Nucleic acid binder design. Structure first.
Ligand SMILES: [Mg+2]
Ligand SMILES: [Mg+2]
Ligand SMILES: [Mg+2]
Ligand SMILES: [Mg+2]
Ligand SMILES: [Mg+2]
Ligand SMILES: [Mg+2]
Ligand SMILES: [Mg+2]
Ligand SMILES: [Mg+2]
Ligand SMILES: [Mg+2]
Ligand SMILES: [Mg+2]
Ligand SMILES: [Mg+2]
Ligand SMILES: [Mg+2]
Ligand SMILES: [Mg+2]
Ligand SMILES: [Mg+2]
Ligand SMILES: [Mg+2]
Ligand SMILES: [Mg+2]
Ligand SMILES: [Mg+2]
Ligand SMILES: [Mg+2]
Ligand SMILES: [Mg+2]
Ligand SMILES: [Mg+2]
Ligand SMILES: [Mg+2]
Ligand SMILES: [Mg+2]
Ligand SMILES: [Mg+2]
Ligand SMILES: [Mg+2]
Ligand SMILES: [Mg+2]
Ligand SMILES: [Mg+2]
Ligand SMILES: [Mg+2]
Ligand SMILES: [Mg+2]
Ligand SMILES: [Mg+2]
Ligand SMILES: [Mg+2]
Ligand SMILES: [Mg+2]
Ligand SMILES: [Mg+2]
Ligand SMILES: [Mg+2]
Ligand SMILES: [Mg+2]
Ligand SMILES: [Mg+2]
Ligand SMILES: [Mg+2]
Ligand SMILES: [Mg+2]
Ligand SMILES: [Mg+2]
Ligand SMILES: [Mg+2]
Ligand SMILES: [Mg+2]
Ligand SMILES: [Mg+2]
Ligand SMILES: [Mg+2]
Ligand SMILES: [Mg+2]
Ligand SMILES: [Mg+2]
Ligand SMILES: [Mg+2]
Ligand SMILES: [Mg+2]
Ligand SMILES: [Mg+2]
Ligand SMILES: [Mg+2]
Ligand SMILES: [Mg+2]
Ligand SMILES: [Mg+2]
Ligand SMILES: [Mg+2]
Ligand SMILES: [Mg+2]
Ligand SMILES: [Mg+2]
Ligand SMILES: [Mg+2]
Ligand SMILES: [Mg+2]
Ligand SMILES: [Mg+2]
Ligand SMILES: [Mg+2]
Ligand SMILES: [Mg+2]
Ligand SMILES: [Mg+2]
Ligand SMILES: [Mg+2]
Ligand SMILES: [Mg+2]
Ligand SMILES: [Mg+2]
Ligand SMILES: [Mg+2]
Ligand SMILES: [Mg+2]
Ligand SMILES: [Mg+2]
Ligand SMILES: [Mg+2]
Ligand SMILES: [Mg+2]
Ligand SMILES: [Mg+2]
Ligand SMILES: [Mg+2]
Ligand SMILES: [Mg+2]
Ligand SMILES: [Mg+2]
Lengths: 150, 64, 49, 102, 9
RNA sequence: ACCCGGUGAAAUUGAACUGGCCGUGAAGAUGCGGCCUACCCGUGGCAGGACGAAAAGACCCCGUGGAGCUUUACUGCAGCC
RNA sequence: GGAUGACCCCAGGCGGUAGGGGAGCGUUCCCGAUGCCGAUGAAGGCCGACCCGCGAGGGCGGCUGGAGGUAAGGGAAGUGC
RNA sequence: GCUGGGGCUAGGAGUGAAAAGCUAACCGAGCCCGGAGAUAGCUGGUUCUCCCCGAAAUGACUUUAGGGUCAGCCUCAGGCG
RNA sequence: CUGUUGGGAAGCAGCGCCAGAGAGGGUGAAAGCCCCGUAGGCGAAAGGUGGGGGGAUAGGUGAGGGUACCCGAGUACCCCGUGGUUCGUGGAGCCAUGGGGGAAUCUGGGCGGACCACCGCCUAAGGCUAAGUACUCCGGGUGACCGAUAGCGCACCAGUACCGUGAGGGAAAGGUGAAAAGAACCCCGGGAGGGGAGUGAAAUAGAGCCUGAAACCGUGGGCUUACAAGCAGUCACGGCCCCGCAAGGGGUUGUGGCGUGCCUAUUGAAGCAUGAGCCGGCGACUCACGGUCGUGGGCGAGCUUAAGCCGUUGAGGCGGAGGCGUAGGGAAACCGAGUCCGAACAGGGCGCAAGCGCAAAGUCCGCGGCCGUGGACCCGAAACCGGGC
RNA sequence: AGCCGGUAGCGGGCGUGGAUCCCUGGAUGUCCGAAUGGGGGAACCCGGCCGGCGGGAACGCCGGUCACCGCGCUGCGCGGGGGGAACCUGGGGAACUGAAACAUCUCAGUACCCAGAGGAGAGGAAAGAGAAAUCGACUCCCUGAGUAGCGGCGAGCGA
């Protein structure tokens, strides 16, 4: 191919933007802002995803999701990420953490809890926690140690 | 620059897996002197309607 | 990647020259003919993979 | 500082212009204007100077400057480019065939 | 000019 | 002031080929309707009109506009105790 | 009608402000150019009762002008009063 | 009493035989520069072309009433049909 | 190099040639080879730099036991008053401090968010310390940067002229020609300025000079007009004038018919509501980062990189920290294809349930609409505050 | 191999016994200006002490020297003043505006004043971070992260 040969196929040459140019482009004079007042003016309106015109907004609902934390902030506790048997029905090695995340299922700072639905491959599954239900399902095919080391 | 999460909203509303917005019910605070037991028990959670789309717009980044 | 060679086709109007690690679509398309030694084709092949 | 390839002593071919082919000794070099006068361009300079020295006098001849890129140096042949060959002291200019000027 | 006259008449 | 020679501005100005009456029309028409009157162009004058000019109405009201002032308005500060 | 468009049919729809949407036309600049056009005349200027386009415009011709201009296809905006 | 020359006091400050006078031809708070492209829910203006559709001037709440948020009425895409 | 058309060759044509050099600029126009250069190479006696290489000097380096001498003072610490930190008195720590009180030397002291205990981290009240980072008066390079109302205020002797007591404000104004060859001389005129002559390719290129647009002001010609009523046009006929063999077309207007300027603002304007003397230039929907839909693609239970690193006649790769997605519920503990409320295996609320190699959840860029934060469509206040005059 | 700047002209010179011009160093450098002997309305006025000059005592000129502060020696020596486009640190420090009013809050340690440092400044050898029997000075970039949190729990601020 040449350069006088290139070009983008349809929908991507949409590059055509809008306007406040002539009459019978539409979009002229009042520039699609209508005759109007506040919204037509330069600054625009208050944040319209939030402002309700002076009456109390829907900030009339209430905080229940209590304990928003106190000044020192978040407490560093452990956190466990779920995986499903189905997802780990992929490979057929010894299935461990680190090995799991190094594949796209965990996220670095999360302790491994296998669980959930799927068919239990006959395999050893090194895990930090198991669901009552997935512990049983896979106990009918393979081994499943629990963790905790320094 | 980056948009900011409206903390007034994050503290009192929730986005469901489907994308609904759930909050509690107004009215169980405060004046229960003798609202009927039906009344005060009737206050669990509800779903706001088309107008929680506005909320969802103020929790861009929270996601799910 | 043959420096002495790249040195000698340079000034010709019809020749644009390029080391193997330069390979890029624009310069490919720009020209009508591609001429690369049995090396380069090496590192080209290593790119795609 | 203003180079130029021809000198006051040199002989030149007029390589272009309306005096192409003409040969002459350059008599004047004005590096600032980048120009040489030879025997080439001479124009009806209307010596207005009636009243002063040199009365009546409708017009005057005189040889007017040429852009120095339009002249070329020459020696036992035609005009040839200058190549400098260093000696054990100074460096002579010499043509692309032997040894121009001395 | 600069006024400064007040609106009288 | 006016006439002649000399020098020669201004605010203003959508464009103009710019009449009256009775009507009509955003309710006060040279410009629309009907009729009436009126050859083309100036100069000296008069000011009824062009809702004449000049100043984004000073009155009034509006804006969650601004200042000056007041006090047993609020909240501060100087000062004093 | 299978021609797979911008071909021939038949039938309907097409007042329009705020607006929504869809097609395009010009202006500056980049790739296309170490190319092409340009003194036998570039851009720009002044005419046309001629050709093409629904139109914005694009062509052709003559006079002016004297040295620059830039296709098809795309890209980017200080883009049309 | 008037007046010459030489001096001093200034911006929330001077000075005032008191008017809110005067403080470099505008003083109910000087002038210049800067924050500053202050803010203006107000006024004005917002430039090329063609094609299809095409409203509202209502209700609720609003220190809200010439401004807004949700609904209603418009348009476009996708789906159901 | 030659010839060719041209005022001028570099264009065009004919045979050549260089190239680690075909970046660019200049030469009467359009040059790889005419000029300056470019690639590639060389150069300081003197001054400056020297973070790179070498050398020297200062300076410093060990174990055991015993003594308990020393280890930064109105300091720690506590209180009152405050500042700093994301922390607005909050359960308020830590770090600074003005006031008051006021220790200790290793079994001494501060801290790990009031406090206490336990377990740990540190060793305050003395100081110095390159590099990596910010900036651009100055030098250089590049440009999908401006091209004289633009681009800095100034391309031109501009922070000038000018304005103001002063601080301060602040302009306008670039181009003959390749070369002045800038028009000798005669003629009118006091000059100015013309007419000839002459230079030049071009003299409406003649110097209040390239191109010379429009408003505006003239002269000449064609048509038309003094019984005529006018948003000035339009539609019909008609006459006169000019083109075209012809048919037709242009200019003009006599008569007849029809006819309430433009814009804004409005329930409604020809409006006696707004704005516009006319013309030409300048002049208003942006961009950055986020976000939400749509769309063009890449890969798809995955997708994707950021800083930075290396490589570049504008050549791209590496880099997986991280982000978004595969699980959802619950204030949370926690549980999990479910969970929550609940005594409940009632109920209900949020949730989960795979399309037939193609395709797709999802992601990453390009593009487009709109939103968020920013002067965010442009213009404009009355004012407020700071430092100066 | 030309040259006496822009700059031609009148009128004179220099250069191949090496000019103009470019680079380095050196020389001179009136007077004002931190301005510094003392005054002062900047570019002017008046001096002291030593040496020189003219007949030179009165006068005048030339050369040298004489401000103040800080530090170190017992009057001497070392240093300091002022300036700089932006950038930097510290000592002070607003208001319009945002909150659709407004006072806590925001704007914002922003603008600006002031002092000082430099080619950078600041910071920097742990009475530190922090939950990892863990990191190891400081600084800058990217993440972490609009997260933890802060807030008339408002607008917003923000590790
Ligand atoms: Mg419209
Ligand atoms: Mg409108
Ligand atoms: Mg308007
Ligand atoms: Mg506004
Ligand atoms: Mg809303
Ligand atoms: Mg209210
Ligand atoms: Mg609401
Ligand atoms: Mg309660
Ligand atoms: Mg209950
Ligand atoms: Mg996130
Ligand atoms: Mg090449
Ligand atoms: Mg007269
Ligand atoms: Mg009349
Ligand atoms: Mg009437
Ligand atoms: Mg009419
Ligand atoms: Mg009438
Ligand atoms: Mg009158
Ligand atoms: Mg009037
Ligand atoms: Mg008014
Ligand atoms: Mg109010
Ligand atoms: Mg205000
Ligand atoms: Mg229509
Ligand atoms: Mg052009
Ligand atoms: Mg513009
Ligand atoms: Mg007073
Ligand atoms: Mg004044
Ligand atoms: Mg006065
Ligand atoms: Mg005041
Ligand atoms: Mg005031
Ligand atoms: Mg501001
Ligand atoms: Mg403004
Ligand atoms: Mg509003
Ligand atoms: Mg319709
Ligand atoms: Mg209205
Ligand atoms: Mg819709
Ligand atoms: Mg549809
Ligand atoms: Mg070189
Ligand atoms: Mg110590
Ligand atoms: Mg605080
Ligand atoms: Mg403490
Ligand atoms: Mg600690
Ligand atoms: Mg603790
Ligand atoms: Mg520590
Ligand atoms: Mg340009
Ligand atoms: Mg121009
Ligand atoms: Mg300018
Ligand atoms: Mg200017
Ligand atoms: Mg003449
Ligand atoms: Mg000409
Ligand atoms: Mg020209
Ligand atoms: Mg001209
Ligand atoms: Mg008649
Ligand atoms: Mg008619
Ligand atoms: Mg009205
Ligand atoms: Mg009205
Ligand atoms: Mg009007
Ligand atoms: Mg009128
Ligand atoms: Mg009026
Ligand atoms: Mg009005
Ligand atoms: Mg008017
Ligand atoms: Mg937009
Ligand atoms: Mg988008
Ligand atoms: Mg997208
Ligand atoms: Mg359930
Ligand atoms: Mg702003
Ligand atoms: Mg915007
Ligand atoms: Mg002095
Ligand atoms: Mg205020
Ligand atoms: Mg406010
Ligand atoms: Mg330092
Ligand atoms: Mg802050």
């Amino acid at each position: 191919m040449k350069l006088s040969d290139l070009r983008p196929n349809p929908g991507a040459n949409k590059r055509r933007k809008r306007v406040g140019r002539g009459p019978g482009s539409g979009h002229g004079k009042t520039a699609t802002r209508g005759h109007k007042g506040q919204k037509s003016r330069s600054g625009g309106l208050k944040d319209p995803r939030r402002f309700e015109g002076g009456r109390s907004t829907t900030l009339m609902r209430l905080p229940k999701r209590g304990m928003q934390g106190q000044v020192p902030g978040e407490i560093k506790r452990p956190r466990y990420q779920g995986v499903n048997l189905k997802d780990l029905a992929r490979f057929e090695g010894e299935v461990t953490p680190e090995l799991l995340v190094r594949a796209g299922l965990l996220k670095k700072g999360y302790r491994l809890k296998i669980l959930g639905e799927g068919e239990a491959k006959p395999l050893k599954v090194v895990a930090h926690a198991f669901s009552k239900s997935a512990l049983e399902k896979l106990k009918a095919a393979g081994g499943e140690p629990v963790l905790l080391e320094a | 620059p980056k948009m900011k999460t409206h903390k007034g909203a994050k503290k009192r509303v929730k986005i469901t897996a489907s994308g609904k917005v759930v909050a509690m019910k107004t009215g169980k605070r405060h004046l229960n002197w003798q609202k009927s037991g039906k009344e005060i028990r009737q206050k669990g959670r509800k779903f706001v309607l088309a107008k929680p789309e506005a909320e969802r717009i103020k929790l861009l980044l929270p996601y799910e | 990647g043959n420096e002495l060679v790249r040195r000698a086709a340079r000034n010709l109007p019809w020749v644009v020259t390029l080391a193997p690690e330069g390979l890029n679509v624009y310069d490919i398309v720009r020209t009508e003919r591609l001429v690369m030694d049995l090396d380069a084709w090496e590192v080209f092949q290593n790119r795609i993979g | 500082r203003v180079k130029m390839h021809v000198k006051k002593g040199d002989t030149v071919l007029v390589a272009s212009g309306k005096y192409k082919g003409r040969v002459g000794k350059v008599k004047e070099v004005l590096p600032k204007k980048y120009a040489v006068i030879v025997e080439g361009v001479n124009i009806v300079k209307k010596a207005v100077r009636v009243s002063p020295k040199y009365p009546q006098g409708g017009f005057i001849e005189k040889e007017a400057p040429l852009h120095a890129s339009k002249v070329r140096p020459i020696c036992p042949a035609c005009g040839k480019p200058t190549r400098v060959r260093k000696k054990f002291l100074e460096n002579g200019k010499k043509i692309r065939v032997c040894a121009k000027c001395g | 000019x600069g006024g400064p006259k007040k609106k009288k008449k």
